[PDB]
Design an enzyme around this catalytic site. Structure first.
Site, PDB file in Angstrom:
ATOM      1  N   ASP A   1      61.583  43.791 109.575  1.00  0.00           N
ATOM      2  CA  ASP A   1      62.494  42.900 108.848  1.00  0.00           C
ATOM      3  C   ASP A   1      61.623  41.815 108.237  1.00  0.00           C
ATOM      4  O   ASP A   1      61.187  40.894 108.926  1.00  0.00           O
ATOM      5  CB  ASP A   1      63.568  42.325 109.778  1.00  0.00           C
ATOM      6  CG  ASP A   1      64.579  41.434 109.045  1.00  0.00           C
ATOM      7  OD1 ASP A   1      64.322  41.040 107.894  1.00  0.00           O
ATOM      8  OD2 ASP A   1      65.624  41.103 109.629  1.00  0.00           O
TER       9      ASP A   1
ATOM     10  N   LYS B   1      65.594  33.452 100.268  1.00  0.00           N
ATOM     11  CA  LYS B   1      64.458  32.968 101.121  1.00  0.00           C
ATOM     12  C   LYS B   1      63.169  32.904 100.277  1.00  0.00           C
ATOM     13  O   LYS B   1      63.245  32.423  99.151  1.00  0.00           O
ATOM     14  CB  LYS B   1      64.346  33.697 102.469  1.00  0.00           C
ATOM     15  CG  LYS B   1      65.654  33.864 103.225  1.00  0.00           C
ATOM     16  CD  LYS B   1      65.482  34.253 104.666  1.00  0.00           C
ATOM     17  CE  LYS B   1      66.738  34.859 105.250  1.00  0.00           C
ATOM     18  NZ  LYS B   1      66.737  34.777 106.725  1.00  0.00           N
TER      19      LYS B   1
ATOM     20  N   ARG C   1      71.533  35.691  97.035  1.00  0.00           N
ATOM     21  CA  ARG C   1      71.898  36.105  98.389  1.00  0.00           C
ATOM     22  C   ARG C   1      72.308  37.551  98.435  1.00  0.00           C
ATOM     23  O   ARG C   1      73.256  37.931  97.814  1.00  0.00           O
ATOM     24  CB  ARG C   1      72.964  35.219  99.050  1.00  0.00           C
ATOM     25  CG  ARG C   1      72.514  33.815  99.275  1.00  0.00           C
ATOM     26  CD  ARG C   1      73.384  33.059 100.256  1.00  0.00           C
ATOM     27  NE  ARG C   1      72.773  31.757 100.323  1.00  0.00           N
ATOM     28  CZ  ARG C   1      71.918  31.392 101.254  1.00  0.00           C
ATOM     29  NH1 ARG C   1      71.669  32.205 102.260  1.00  0.00           N
ATOM     30  NH2 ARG C   1      71.358  30.204 101.194  1.00  0.00           N
TER      31      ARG C   1
ATOM     32  N   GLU D   1      80.979  52.575  93.022  1.00  0.00           N
ATOM     33  CA  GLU D   1      80.579  53.251  94.252  1.00  0.00           C
ATOM     34  C   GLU D   1      79.753  54.480  93.934  1.00  0.00           C
ATOM     35  O   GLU D   1      79.998  55.178  92.945  1.00  0.00           O
ATOM     36  CB  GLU D   1      81.797  53.670  95.067  1.00  0.00           C
ATOM     37  CG  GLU D   1      82.456  52.466  95.674  1.00  0.00           C
ATOM     38  CD  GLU D   1      83.673  52.811  96.479  1.00  0.00           C
ATOM     39  OE1 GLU D   1      84.193  53.947  96.322  1.00  0.00           O
ATOM     40  OE2 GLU D   1      84.108  51.927  97.250  1.00  0.00           O
TER      41      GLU D   1
ATOM     42  N   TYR E   1      83.827  48.603  89.194  1.00  0.00           N
ATOM     43  CA  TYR E   1      83.692  49.338  90.469  1.00  0.00           C
ATOM     44  C   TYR E   1      82.656  50.424  90.201  1.00  0.00           C
ATOM     45  O   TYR E   1      82.799  51.159  89.212  1.00  0.00           O
ATOM     46  CB  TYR E   1      85.002  49.951  90.964  1.00  0.00           C
ATOM     47  CG  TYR E   1      85.464  49.354  92.282  1.00  0.00           C
ATOM     48  CD1 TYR E   1      84.816  49.653  93.472  1.00  0.00           C
ATOM     49  CD2 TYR E   1      86.530  48.468  92.324  1.00  0.00           C
ATOM     50  CE1 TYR E   1      85.226  49.095  94.671  1.00  0.00           C
ATOM     51  CE2 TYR E   1      86.948  47.905  93.517  1.00  0.00           C
ATOM     52  CZ  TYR E   1      86.293  48.214  94.694  1.00  0.00           C
ATOM     53  OH  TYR E   1      86.712  47.655  95.865  1.00  0.00           O
TER      54      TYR E   1
ATOM     55  N   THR F   1      66.051  40.288 102.970  1.00  0.00           N
ATOM     56  CA  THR F   1      66.964  39.604 102.066  1.00  0.00           C
ATOM     57  C   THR F   1      66.260  39.423 100.728  1.00  0.00           C
ATOM     58  O   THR F   1      65.042  39.556 100.636  1.00  0.00           O
ATOM     59  CB  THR F   1      67.391  38.242 102.617  1.00  0.00           C
ATOM     60  OG1 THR F   1      66.222  37.474 102.925  1.00  0.00           O
ATOM     61  CG2 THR F   1      68.216  38.435 103.875  1.00  0.00           C
TER      62      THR F   1
HETATM   63  N1  LIG Z   1      92.541  58.070  98.262  1.00  0.00           N
HETATM   64  C1  LIG Z   1      91.439  57.425  97.888  1.00  0.00           C
HETATM   65  N2  LIG Z   1      91.086  57.336  96.618  1.00  0.00           N
HETATM   66  C2  LIG Z   1      89.954  56.660  96.314  1.00  0.00           C
HETATM   67  C3  LIG Z   1      89.147  56.058  97.308  1.00  0.00           C
HETATM   68  C4  LIG Z   1      89.536  56.162  98.644  1.00  0.00           C
HETATM   69  O1  LIG Z   1      88.941  55.697  99.606  1.00  0.00           O
HETATM   70  N3  LIG Z   1      90.696  56.860  98.880  1.00  0.00           N
HETATM   71  N4  LIG Z   1      87.983  55.355  96.888  1.00  0.00           N
HETATM   72  C5  LIG Z   1      87.569  54.256  97.576  1.00  0.00           C
HETATM   73  O2  LIG Z   1      86.625  53.573  97.354  1.00  0.00           O
HETATM   74  C6  LIG Z   1      87.323  55.873  95.682  1.00  0.00           C
HETATM   75  C7  LIG Z   1      86.666  57.239  95.942  1.00  0.00           C
HETATM   76  N5  LIG Z   1      85.531  57.144  96.831  1.00  0.00           N
HETATM   77  C8  LIG Z   1      85.139  58.143  97.682  1.00  0.00           C
HETATM   78  C9  LIG Z   1      83.793  58.315  97.992  1.00  0.00           C
HETATM   79  C10 LIG Z   1      83.403  59.317  98.850  1.00  0.00           C
HETATM   80  C11 LIG Z   1      84.328  60.169  99.431  1.00  0.00           C
HETATM   81  C12 LIG Z   1      83.860  61.269 100.348  1.00  0.00           C
HETATM   82  O3  LIG Z   1      84.584  61.812 101.127  1.00  0.00           O
HETATM   83  N6  LIG Z   1      82.596  61.574 100.145  1.00  0.00           N
HETATM   84  C13 LIG Z   1      81.894  62.606 100.829  1.00  0.00           C
HETATM   85  C14 LIG Z   1      82.098  63.978 100.188  1.00  0.00           C
HETATM   86  C15 LIG Z   1      81.757  64.219  98.759  1.00  0.00           C
HETATM   87  C16 LIG Z   1      82.222  65.634  98.445  1.00  0.00           C
HETATM   88  O4  LIG Z   1      81.697  66.549  99.067  1.00  0.00           O
HETATM   89  O5  LIG Z   1      83.098  65.828  97.607  1.00  0.00           O
HETATM   90  C17 LIG Z   1      80.434  62.263 101.150  1.00  0.00           C
HETATM   91  O6  LIG Z   1      79.934  61.302 100.584  1.00  0.00           O
HETATM   92  O7  LIG Z   1      79.872  62.985 101.960  1.00  0.00           O
HETATM   93  C18 LIG Z   1      85.665  60.000  99.107  1.00  0.00           C
HETATM   94  C19 LIG Z   1      86.073  59.000  98.252  1.00  0.00           C
HETATM   95  C20 LIG Z   1      88.353  55.936  94.558  1.00  0.00           C
HETATM   96  N7  LIG Z   1      89.582  56.566  95.001  1.00  0.00           N
HETATM   97  C1  LIG Z   2      92.797  49.667 100.806  1.00  0.00           C
HETATM   98  C2  LIG Z   2      91.359  49.373 100.569  1.00  0.00           C
HETATM   99  N1  LIG Z   2      90.606  48.835 101.516  1.00  0.00           N
HETATM  100  C3  LIG Z   2      89.285  48.525 101.412  1.00  0.00           C
HETATM  101  C4  LIG Z   2      88.612  48.758 100.238  1.00  0.00           C
HETATM  102  C5  LIG Z   2      87.141  48.415 100.158  1.00  0.00           C
HETATM  103  O1  LIG Z   2      86.870  47.172  99.576  1.00  0.00           O
HETATM  104  P1  LIG Z   2      85.278  46.972  98.986  1.00  0.00           P
HETATM  105  O2  LIG Z   2      85.163  48.063  97.952  1.00  0.00           O
HETATM  106  O3  LIG Z   2      84.406  47.187 100.207  1.00  0.00           O
HETATM  107  O4  LIG Z   2      85.312  45.554  98.449  1.00  0.00           O
HETATM  108  C6  LIG Z   2      89.332  49.332  99.153  1.00  0.00           C
HETATM  109  C7  LIG Z   2      88.708  49.605  97.896  1.00  0.00           C
HETATM  110  N2  LIG Z   2      89.011  50.612  97.136  1.00  0.00           N
HETATM  111  C8  LIG Z   2      88.419  50.929  95.853  1.00  0.00           C
HETATM  112  C9  LIG Z   2      89.315  51.748  94.884  1.00  0.00           C
HETATM  113  O5  LIG Z   2      90.382  51.926  95.349  1.00  0.00           O
HETATM  114  O6  LIG Z   2      88.852  52.140  93.812  1.00  0.00           O
HETATM  115  C10 LIG Z   2      90.734  49.653  99.286  1.00  0.00           C
HETATM  116  O7  LIG Z   2      91.405  50.164  98.356  1.00  0.00           O
END
Ligand SMILES: Nc1nc2c(c(=O)[nH]1)N(C=O)[C@@H](CNc1ccc(C(=O)N[C@@H](CCC(=O)O)C(=O)O)cc1)CN2
Ligand SMILES: Cc1ncc(COP(=O)(O)O)c(/C=N/CC(=O)O)c1O
Lengths: 402, 402
Positions: free
Chosen positions: A192, A221, A227, A48, A46, A218
């Site tokens: 695009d 292609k 993909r 993100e 993971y 993409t």
């Molecule tokens: N409860 C919870 N835990 C989780 C997730 C979630 O959705 N919910 N995640 C799910 O994938 C990951 C965390 N991902 C996240 C990414 C961005 C933000 C967010 O609010 N970002 C803001 C602010 C950043 C800041 O100022 O601290 C932003 O991008 O503007 C929160 C969670 C892992 N744990």
């Molecule tokens: C309840 C729920 N719903 C949707 C998603 C998004 O799934 P994708 O990351 O877009 O595959 C998540 C992923 N969460 C990532 C994590 O928890 O670290 C989830 O806990």
């Protein structure tokens, strides 16, 4: 325990691909090393966020992978910013639309009937549900886009975004004129380039980077990658905005195994052998169109500047639907497509779209296009037969897949 | 020419995964045969549409692959309808919301810090940009959901959709009660079971399918499959609507190589061994949480019913970001995570989240959890050292990787 039923299907699909002639313009065959990257353990991570600013521990190596994809994309296309995380071309376009527009805003794009993409404004598509869509098309007499009609629509409807690029347009785009129109009404120009991205990378198609505000694409292609989607721009400030719409706006975890595959495809496209491949793609398409013209078909716009062309079937009294079925029955895959001056409806059409990227990847060269043209013609006039299916198979097997 | 630099990075990531303790609750290690399907030639086919109703020809084998994935998902979860095309959990949720709501409708979901996912109504996500969001949380004393608070909120705000499910809630859900509440206001109940889908399949977690109108999930967490999304329902008329929002609504061509990987993961989840694996996941999580509690760490809600738990680090004077970095330095990978009523923003946090699925796949047993707890404790209190890293490495290398 091995999933035998599933892998029996994969072997059958491999056989189908080897033994047929794939002429759908948006298809290609990826290399073994693109598949090796996509099938890697990078799917387990993971990751993100963006390189150096992730929401999970353990991303040190993933950051080098994604940064490598980004820097190669910028070097390949001459861009100042890139985002390699979109899951598909659809997600790339969606993020750009949501970053530049609010619901209710006006989007202008090429009409589906004249060659536009679903994402360029279809009313069954998100673009047509969230925004007000205005469409442009081609002229019946020129079979080409009319820049004066585009400008007239832009002045009358004042779109916030104008999209250039389409799925079935066989000629070059004038990105400079599109940007002039956009500037006159204060719109953003989005290009695009999904269909012709490989030709841009090889220098065989005008590059939109300098004229568009944002470029979507993409990686499959003509670019011959996995993909997935891609976004580029010459404006890093706009790029920062779009980065936020990709995450956390519309996606969650990126597919880092597919991003490693994008890095591989960009490496392949940076090699000189890619330019040669791309030249052959365009030479094959021009030669195949000429050979079908000689056999009695009409080519829309009279030819092509790129990897695809549109065949007007009216001289032989066929619809696009019937030609599709007759060709599918001998292992030749095309798709039906409306022609500009089309007496038939959309589900039937009077034309087909053909593209050479996939057969060019399998080593077909312009001197073999007479033979391909004759097989197509025989299938359309004589109909499907076992002898004809065997000739296609033999020809296909004589040209290896990557 | 082989892309040697990229493959060197992939080899480095393989080593990193083998030589550390991957404790991110949303990660797992897929089998070789899942990777084999995802790395297959099925990426070479554009399969827009659905089985037996595709836009393009040549999909006769692809259709059997997708139908197999669909029918196995239905058999695994007891659903009347499934859609296996969503590129991710986020796209699965997007399609469902757009099928059930218009922009500006009211969405009810779990507050992020309390445990809800970004797509359950965050303002920086499409869910909070397109819909009016009302959030429920947990009680300050027990850190459990209060169903009477949920009911009050639903009666006051009259949501169109209520979402149950979370990314960091460590206890069971009462789906019957959530459905009763939804029925009181005429809402749809959507359950996002992404995190606990594998536990549901193994019979170790209440099944939402009889009570939810629609169930969304990812294929890559507890289900141990490729990265991607999934939608299920017991209502095939609602499923038809959702199918149209996936395509042509928000996506284009599906990733059929990944869908082949989903079919394989469903086959693996149907085997008796998967139930034993899932039982050990939960046993490991309960034991590891207990061992950390015995060392003085505060576990949110006091424990866990499932594969994950949260550590409140405020008493130890550590932010979640600092703890993640300290653990990462010795090869223990977790993620900083918001805790209920967290005073700190998501980029910092006051806690960490830990999950057992990945190390359980590598054969870790409950008797080994005291050693894991010791290594975690030492890295937090004493900080990173070379001797600690080496101990983590030896323990990790003693367990095989799929
Ligand atoms: N409860 C919870 N835990 C989780 C997730 C979630 O959705 N919910 N995640 C799910 O994938 C990951 C965390 N991902 C996240 C990414 C961005 C933000 C967010 O609010 N970002 C803001 C602010 C950043 C800041 O100022 O601290 C932003 O991008 O503007 C929160 C969670 C892992 N744990
Ligand atoms: C309840 C729920 N719903 C949707 C998603 C998004 O799934 P994708 O990351 O877009 O595959 C998540 C992923 N969460 C990532 C994590 O928890 O670290 C989830 O806990």
């Amino acid at each position: 325990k091995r999933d035998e039923a599933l892998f029996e299907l994969i072997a059958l699909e491999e056989k189908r691909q080897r033994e047929g002639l794939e002429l759908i313009a948006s298809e290609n065959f990826v290399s073994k090393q693109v598949r090796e990257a996509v099938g890697s353990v990078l799917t387990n991570k993971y990751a993100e966020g963006y390189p150096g600013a992730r929401y999970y521990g353990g991303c040190e190596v993933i950051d080098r992978v994604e940064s490598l994809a980004i820097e190669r994309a910028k070097a390949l296309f001459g861009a100042a910013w890139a985002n390699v995380q979109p899951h598909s071309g659809s997600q790339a376009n969606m993020a750009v639309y949501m970053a530049l527009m609010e619901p209710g805003d006006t989007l202008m794009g090429m009409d589906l009937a004249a060659g536009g993409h679903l994402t360029h404004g279809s009313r069954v598509n998100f673009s047509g549900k969230l925004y007000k869509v205005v469409s442009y098309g081609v002229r019946p007499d020129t079979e080409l886009i009319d820049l004066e009609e585009v400008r007239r629509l832009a002045l009358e409807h004042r779109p916030k975004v104008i999209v250039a690029g389409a799925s079935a347009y066989p000629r070059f785009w004038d990105f400079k004129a599109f940007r002039e129109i956009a500037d006159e009404v204060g719109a953003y120009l989005v290009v695009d380039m999904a269909h012709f991205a490989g030709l841009v990378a090889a220098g065989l198609h005008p590059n939109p980077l300098p004229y568009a505000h944002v470029v979507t694409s993409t990686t499959h292609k003509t670019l011959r990658g996995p993909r997935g989607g891609l976004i580029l721009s010459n404006d890093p400030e706009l790029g920062k905005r779009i980065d936020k719409l990709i995450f956390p706006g519309i996606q969650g975890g990126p597919l880092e195994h597919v991003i490693a595959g994008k890095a591989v495809a960009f490496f392949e496209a940076l090699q000189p052998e890619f330019k040669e491949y791309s030249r052959l793609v365009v030479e094959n398409a021009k030669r195949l169109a000429e050979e079908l013209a000689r056999r009695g078909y009409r080519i829309v716009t009279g030819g092509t500047d790129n990897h695809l062309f549109l065949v007007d079937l009216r001289p032989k009294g066929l619809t696009g639907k019937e030609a599709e079925e007759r060709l599918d029955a001998v292992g030749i895959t095309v798709n039906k497509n409306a022609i500009p001056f089309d007496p038939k409806p959309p589900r039937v059409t009077s034309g087909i779209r053909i593209g050479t990227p996939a057969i060019t990847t399998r080593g077909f060269t312009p001197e073999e296009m007479p033979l391909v043209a004759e097989l197509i013609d025989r299938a359309l006039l004589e109909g499907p037969s076992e002898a004809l299916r065997e000739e296609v198979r033999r020809l296909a097997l004589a040209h290896p897949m990557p």
